Symmetry: D2
Subunit: 490 residues, 4 copies
Amino acid sequence: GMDKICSPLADNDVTQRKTQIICTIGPSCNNVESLIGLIDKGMSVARLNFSHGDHESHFKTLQNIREAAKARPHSTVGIMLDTKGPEIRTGMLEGGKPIELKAGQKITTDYSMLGNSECISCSYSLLPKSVQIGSTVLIADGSLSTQVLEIGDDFIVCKVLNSVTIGERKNMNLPGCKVHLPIIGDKDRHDIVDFALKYNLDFIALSFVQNGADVQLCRQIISENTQYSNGIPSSIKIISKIENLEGVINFDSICSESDGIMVARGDLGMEIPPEKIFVAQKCMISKCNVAGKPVVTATQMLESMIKSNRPTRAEMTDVANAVLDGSDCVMLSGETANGAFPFDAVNVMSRVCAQAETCIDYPVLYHAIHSSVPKPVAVPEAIACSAVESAHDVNAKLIITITETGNTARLISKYRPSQTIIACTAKPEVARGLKIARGVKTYVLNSIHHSEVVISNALALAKEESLIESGDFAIAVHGVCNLMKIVRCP
Amino acid sequence: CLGMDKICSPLADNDVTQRKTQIICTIGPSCNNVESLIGLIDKGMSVARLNFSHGDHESHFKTLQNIREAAKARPHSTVGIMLDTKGPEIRTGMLEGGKPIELKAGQTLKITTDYSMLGNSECISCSYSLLPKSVQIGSTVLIADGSLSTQVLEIGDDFIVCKVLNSVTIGERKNMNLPGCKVHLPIIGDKDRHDIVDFALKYNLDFIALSFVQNGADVQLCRQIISENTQYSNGIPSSIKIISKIENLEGVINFDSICSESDGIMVARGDLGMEIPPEKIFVAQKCMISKCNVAGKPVVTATQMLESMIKSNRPTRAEMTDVANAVLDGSDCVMLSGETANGAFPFDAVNVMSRVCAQAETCIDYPVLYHAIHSSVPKPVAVPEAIACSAVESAHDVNAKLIITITETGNTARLISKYRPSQTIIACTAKPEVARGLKIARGVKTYVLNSIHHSEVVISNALALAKEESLIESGDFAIAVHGVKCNLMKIVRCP
Amino acid sequence: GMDKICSPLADNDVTQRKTQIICTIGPSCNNVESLIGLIDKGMSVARLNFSHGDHESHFKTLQNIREAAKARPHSTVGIMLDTKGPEIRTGMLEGGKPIELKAGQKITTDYSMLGNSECISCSYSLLPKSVQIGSTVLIADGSLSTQVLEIGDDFIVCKVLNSVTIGERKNMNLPGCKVHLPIIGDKDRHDIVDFALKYNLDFIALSFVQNGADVQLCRQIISENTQYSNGIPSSIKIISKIENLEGVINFDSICSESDGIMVARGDLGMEIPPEKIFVAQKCMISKCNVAGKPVVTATQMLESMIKSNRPTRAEMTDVANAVLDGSDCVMLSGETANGAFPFDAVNVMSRVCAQAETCIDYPVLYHAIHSSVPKPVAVPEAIACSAVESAHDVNAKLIITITETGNTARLISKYRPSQTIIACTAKPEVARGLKIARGVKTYVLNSIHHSEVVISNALALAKEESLIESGDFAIAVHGVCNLMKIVRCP
Amino acid sequence: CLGMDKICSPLADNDVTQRKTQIICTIGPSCNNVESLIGLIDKGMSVARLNFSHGDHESHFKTLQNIREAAKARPHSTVGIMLDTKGPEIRTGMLEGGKPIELKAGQTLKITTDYSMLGNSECISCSYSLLPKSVQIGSTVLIADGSLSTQVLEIGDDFIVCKVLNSVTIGERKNMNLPGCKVHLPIIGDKDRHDIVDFALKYNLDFIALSFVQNGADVQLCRQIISENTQYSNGIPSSIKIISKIENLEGVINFDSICSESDGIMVARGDLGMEIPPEKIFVAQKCMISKCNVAGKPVVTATQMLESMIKSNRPTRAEMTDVANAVLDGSDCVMLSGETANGAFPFDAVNVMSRVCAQAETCIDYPVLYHAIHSSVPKPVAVPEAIACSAVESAHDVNAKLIITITETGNTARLISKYRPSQTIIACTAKPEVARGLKIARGVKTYVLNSIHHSEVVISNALALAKEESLIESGDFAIAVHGVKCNLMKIVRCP
C-alpha cells in the first residue's frame, strides 16, 4: 500500500502488537526501574544468559524482574534461561604472551601444555575424530582460519590461511562438522535444575542442539528432577537453539521433540556461509509455522543501536522481514543487555513489528497455512480453523479461548488471525508460557469451570482495556475443546 | 523454491558467475586507483558511481580515467559509469567563535534565515530562506544527521522557533532535514548543471543519479538540460539514463509521476530514513520496487546494505538478510557506498553482496514471478512487449538456456528483463554505450558487435560466444528476438 | 475420473441423493399404489397441474398422495400447486371448420366474432398495446408464425410466414413482449385460496411471473386469506416460474421476492430462441445459488421416456448437466403424468443425479460460493460456512442442524456440503418445505427445546438409517443459531 | 462469460459465420441429391459422413459424386468426406417360420452358437461363436436395440443360458450387445478392408471413422492397411485421418492407448449407451473430451444430439442444452445422424446445431480455458508446440483478430487449435486435402494457395483474403506462424 507510507502507525496497532519481543538482561538494564522501562517499551520475555555470571548475580536479576512484574500487574513477563551449553576453546600459551600466526604453517588434544606459534591446545577431546582431512577450523570466532592436513591419534595438524594476532583461550567453530560434546554438562545440569526448575522459570533456551536425542536428554532431566516442585513435573518450555549445520540437518526431529525453536543466527553465521542464513531462517520459520510451534529470530537484529539512538537501514528491514517470514518472536541481545539505548532498541523493534503486521494479508496467509496441514485433522484444530474464518466473515474484534494448558491458544495462533487471541486460563504459568505465542493476550482467572462466566469476564476486561466495544462480535471457543460460538459484546 | 538442499548444498560458482542482480559500487579513497577498480570488476561490480557531493572535476576526471583504464584491462567485462548529483541541501550557519553550542531538552531554540548572523545556544541560522513557509506548526526539524531533534512552536516572517527534544552538541554548517515537508530549492542549481553538462555529457557517462527528486517536473528539468546541450555529442542528444533518487516523502507521494518520467529509480534509503519513520522504510522499499517492476523501469536499493563491513571483513546478520530480501523484493540493482568508497574491506563487501544476491536468485520461483508481473500489466500491450514475454514463456516451455535479443537501443532487453526469465538475456548491439546502459538491467549480458544488420550472423555469433562462455551447450535451445527489417520470435538450436 | 465409468454407481449414493425430484401427477400415476411406486423410485415433491382438471379431480389425487405418505412414513413428500396463470388463446371460427393459412397474408380484440382465413380473434384484450410494428406473434405453440404490420385501436394486422393448418382456440406467444394480463385471475384466486391454502399445500408454482410486483400480489393474497387456517398466515412457499423474457429481465427482483425459482424451459423455448435456453438456465441457477434460494429445472428433461424404457443420449447429459450447473430440483412433467414408464423416468433421473453429485468437486464448489457472498455476513451464515468447512476437515458423515423455520437448513444447503444435512424440526410443514432443498433430510420430533436430547436422537436415527457409524464425527449446529460443535457418534 | 446481455441481446450473424465447432452431417435419403448437399453447406456442414453399415459401393459412389459436385457449386466452402465402417457385429439367427417369438420375464432362454438351427421361444441362435468365452456368469446380454434384457445363468461349450428380464417380442437377425465384455471379432473384416482400400483410399476421402475400436492394436491394423495399399496414390501412403469410435467399455478402458494411436476420437454415444449405464455417458463424454483436448487430438460428440428433430422442426430442451454443453466440454466436432440422413427437417437440424454451437462459444472464458490446457501439458514441449501457444498468448496480449499459420501438413494448425484461441486460425497450405483434413479442427479456416514457399507473399495474400472476408480490418494485428526455411512467430499489422 502507498498510503501506508504517508499515514503514520496508529497507537492501536503498536499497543495490540502480535510479535513477541525477547529482551536479554544485562548491566545496561539490570535494575528494577530499567526492567519496568523495558516492559513499557514492550518486553514479552526476559532472557537470562548463563554463558556469563553466577547464580547469585542472576538471582538478584530474577528478583528485579519479578519486582518489575508486580509494578506492572496488567502485563505479563516470561523468564528464559539460556544455557552456556557445549563449548570449544583453545589452550594456554606462555600463558602471558599471545602467539603470532602466519599463512602456510597444529592442534593437540593434550590440553595441559604450553602452546607456541608452531603448536596449540584444544579443550575438545574428540577434535581429530570429528574433523576429517580438508575440513576447516575457525579459531577465535572467524579471525583465524585453517584447514585440516593430518589426523593423528591425539592431535590434528592444520595449515593457516591468514595472519592472525590472537590468542589465549579463544573460542572455536567446526563448520559442517558434528561436535560430540554432551548437550548438557555439570555446569548446565546445575543451571537447569538448581535455577530454572528451582525458581520456576518459563523457558529453557537449549544451546547447540544437534538432534532430537539432545532434546530428549533435557526432557529426561526435567522429569527426573522433581525435588523443587514437590514431585510435580515442571511445564517449563524447551526452546532448542539451532546454532550449527547438524541442527539444520536434523531440524524435523528437533522440532518435533522441542516446544519452540530459536534461529541462532550468530553461531550459524560462524558455521554456515552468509548467503545461507536468510535461507536457513526463512525455511526453519516456515516449518515452525506448519508444525504450530513458536519460532524465535535472534542476534544482530538491531546491533547498531548499541552505539546510536537510531538503527541502520539494513536492520530496519531485517526486523520487518522476520515478521513477514512468520516469526513468532524477535530477540535483542547486546542491544538491551550491553547497549547504551535499550529502551530505544525495544521501542524501534516494537513499532517496526507492528507496521509489518499491518502489511500482512491475513486472508491469504490463512489459506497458505490451512492448505499446508494434511486432512483429516483433530477436532480441536478444526475448531481452531473455524474460529479464524468466522472471525473474518463477521468482522469480530477478538477470539476468546478457554484453555487450561494453553495449547488451544497456540492452535489458533498457528492460523494467524488478524484478531487478538484472548486466552482464558487458571494458572499464571500458562500465561507466561504464552509470551512466545504470536498475537496472544492472556487473562488469568480464579476459575475456568463455567464457560458463560469466563466469556462474560473476558469480554468485560477486553472492554476495559479498549480491545472491543458494545455490539462488536467475538468468537468464543471452549468445551461442551470442541465448540465454537459467536457472541455480542454488551 | 526454498528447501533443505538450498542450505546444505553449497553455492555453485556457475550461480555467482551468472548473477542477475547488478552491483553499483561508489568509488572513493579506498578504491580510487586502477588496481582497485580492476579488483571491483573481478568481484562483480556492474556500475561505478561517482559522488559529486564531494570533490572537483579534476579529481573526478582522474578517477574516470582510472575506471576506463581498468575497463581496458578487463575487455570481457562491461562497466557503466554513474554521476550522482549533489542536489539541494540545507545547512546551519556559523557560531560565536565556533566553538560549538550545547542544547538541552525542553529548550526553545530559534532558527533564523539571516545566514550572516553568529549563532548561539538561543538562536542559530539556516541557509534555506523559505524555511518558515515550508514548515508548519508541529513539524519536526532534524539537524546534524538527526542528532538534534526539534519541533516547531511558532513560525515567524524570517525565523522559526523550535522545541529541542534531546540534549546534543551541534557545530557549524551541519545538514538539515524537514520530514513530511517539501523543500523549495532547485533540484539542479548551477553546480549541478556544470556537473551534468561539463562532466556527464562531456565525458559521455551512462547514468545520472538525480538527487532529491520531489516530482515529475524535476525529472523534466534534467530532461530539458540534456536536450539543450549537445556540444559534446555533435548535435545528437545523449542517451544517458536518468535514475531519480527518492529521498523524502514528497518524492514518495509523487512516485508514479517520477517513475513514468524517469529511466530508473533509486530508493535512497539513507535520506528517506531521516525524512520518514524507520517503520516505513521496508514498506517504502517494497512498494516502490513493485511499482518499478510493473513499469519495466530498473530500481536500485541503496545505502547501509553492508554498513558494518566498513570496518570488518564479515557482515551483520541483518545485513545478510537485507541484501537477499532486496533481490527477493524484485530489485534490479543493489548499491555500496562507504563499504567500497572509504572502507577497509571493499573487495569483501562486493564479494559478499555478489554471493548473497546469487543465492537469493536461486530461491526465486520464476514461473510464479512471471505470471505475477504479466497479470499486473494492463492489456492490450504493444508488439515488442508481447514478443518479449512470449520469449520468456517459450524459454520455460522448451527449457531453453538463453534468450537472445538483437537491439539497437537496448529497450527490448529491458522489456525481456521486466518479465524476469530464469535464463540469461543476451543483448546483441552495435553501440558500446548501449551495453553500458544495460548494466542496471537485471539478468542481461550484452555482446557488442561491429554490425547488427544481418540477423542470422548476429545469432550465430551470439551462440558461438555464449557456448565459449559456458552459457549454453550443443543442442540446447535459445530464444532469438529481433525485427523483420522488434516483432519476431525464433526458437533456435545451438550447433 | 476414469474409473468412475468402469466402477458402477453404489447403492449408498443413490439412497443418499441430494437433488430433489419433482414428479407431476396425472392419469398414468394417479392411484395410491402408483404414487407409492414413485416414492420408492425417489419422488421428493408431488406436483398438481391446475391447467387441467377440477377441484374434485385434484382433491381425490390429494387424498391418494397423502394415503401414499402414510404407507411410507419414513419418507417425506411435498405437494405443489401449479396454477394455470395468465393465458392467450385465439377465438372461434365457424366454429366447426378450421381456417387454412398461407404465407403473405389479421387479428382483432373483438373476441365475439366468427374468424375466417382473412381475420381471426384473440382473448388478450391488450394485444395491440403490447406488440409494436415488426414484433412477431406465434399462434398454436410455434406452428404458425406472423409479424406485426399495423397497430389499430381495437385490432392489429399481421403477415404470416408459413402455411399453417390450425386452428380453433389455440394458444399464443408474444416473444420479447410484456403481457399485461393479471398474474392471478379468478380461476387462480380460487385455486390458491380454496385448495392450496384450504388443504394446506407446501408449494405454489406461480405461472408466468414477469416482475417482483407479481410475487407481492400473490404474497398479499396469502396474508389476506387466513380463513382456512384460523387467522394464522400460511408458510406456503412461492416458487416463481420464469416463462418468458420479461421474467428474465426482472429476475433479480423476482428472486428476492420469491422463495424459489423454476426455470420453465418449455414456455421459455417458445419465447426465446433455442440458443439462449442453456444460457438462461445456467445464469438463473447460478444466481439462485448465490441468493441461497432453491431452483428448479423443468420440462422435456427425459421426454423420450414417455414412449420408451430408456432415454435418449441428449436427455442423459441434460439431467447430469442440470445438477452440475447447481440445480436444487429436477422436475418431470409428461414423463410421470402421461407417460407409459413413470417409474423408469423417476428411476433414471434418480441414478443420473446421484452420479452427477459424485462428480462434483465440493472443496472447489464451496469456495466458488463462499467468495461470491459479500463480507461481513450475519452470524447464522458464518456458522453455516464453518459447519461445511469443519465437516470436510474432520471428515464428518453428517451435518445436524436444529431449526424451527428450516432457514438454517437452507443456509447450510447453500454452501453445498458433501455430507447429508440432517434438519431437526418440530412441525411437518417445515420438513415438507425442505423437499426442495438440496441434500437435506428432515427428522420431525415432538420437541426441539433441549439441544443435547435432539442431537442424541438425530444421531440415533441416522445410525438406524445407516447414515453414520460409531466413532464417526458429526457437525452439530444450534442456538446458545450461533453455535457449532463437533460430536462423536456413540 | 455468462450474463444478462448474453440472453437478451440476440445472437449476431458474425458469431454464426465465425463458428469454431465443426459440424459432421450423415448423408442419406433425406439429403442425397446435389441440391440438398449445397443446402447442408449453406447451413454449416463441415464434413459429409458416409455410413457403410448400409448400401453398396455403387450407391455410395453416386453420393460421393454428388458431394463433390456440391463442393464445386460452393468453392469458398471446404467440405471433408468421412467413411464410417460397418465393423464387427452380433446378430440373432432365424426362427421357426419367422414368425417372431414371444418371450416372458422369468423365462430361461438358451442362446446357441449353431447359426443354422431354427430358433423358438426356448432357444435362439447367435452369429458370434465365441459368445460363451466372452460372457461370464451374471453378465447382461441385450438383444434388438436393448428391447430384450437377459442375464447369463449357465455357460456351455457352444451355448449360453440366460434369464429373460422383460417381456418382449423379437424377430430374425436382430443386433446384440454384451455390456462390460470384450467382443473377439476382427475390427476390420473383408468387407471393411474393401470399403477402406477400394473406396476410402481409392476415391481419396479424408477421414476413416473406425467402428468398435477396443484397443490400440485395432488402430494399428487399420494403420497397417493404409501403408500396405498405395495402388491409388502412386506409391505415397495416404494421409487419411483415423477417427476411432469408442462404442463399448473395452474402448473406454483402453482409451489412452487408442487416443495415442488415433488421429481423432468419436464418442459414439449411441452404442456406448447400450454397452454402459445411462448414468455413465455424461462422465464418459466429459472425460474422453478432456483427454483429447490435452492430447491435441480432435474429438467428435455423436448420436441423438437433436433426435426429436427427425420428425419436428424444433428441438427438445434437453437437446438444446446437449449441443451447448458438448461445445463447453471442449468438443471439436458435433454430429448429426438420422437428423440429416433420413429426417424431415435436415436443414433446420444443421441450422439449430450451428446457432447453438456459436452461442456456446461466446460463453467461453478463453484465457481460463487456455491456462487450463497449458498447465495440463507436460513440460518441456517441442519447438512447434511452444510457438503455437505463444501465438495464442500473443494474440490475446495485443488483441489480434487472426492467427495465421503457414503449414504443409496442417499439424501446426492443429497445435494452435489445441490451445483454443478466441481468434480464428487461418491455415495456409498448398494441398486441398490438407484443408479438407482440418475440417474436424475447431476454429480453423484454411486458404489453399498454389505455393507456400515465400512466407511474405503467403501472409499478405492471407491478410488480403481475410480482410475481404470481413475476418480482419485495416490496422488490426495478426499473429503469423511459420518456419525460417515451424519455429518462428511474427506479429504483423493488417495494411
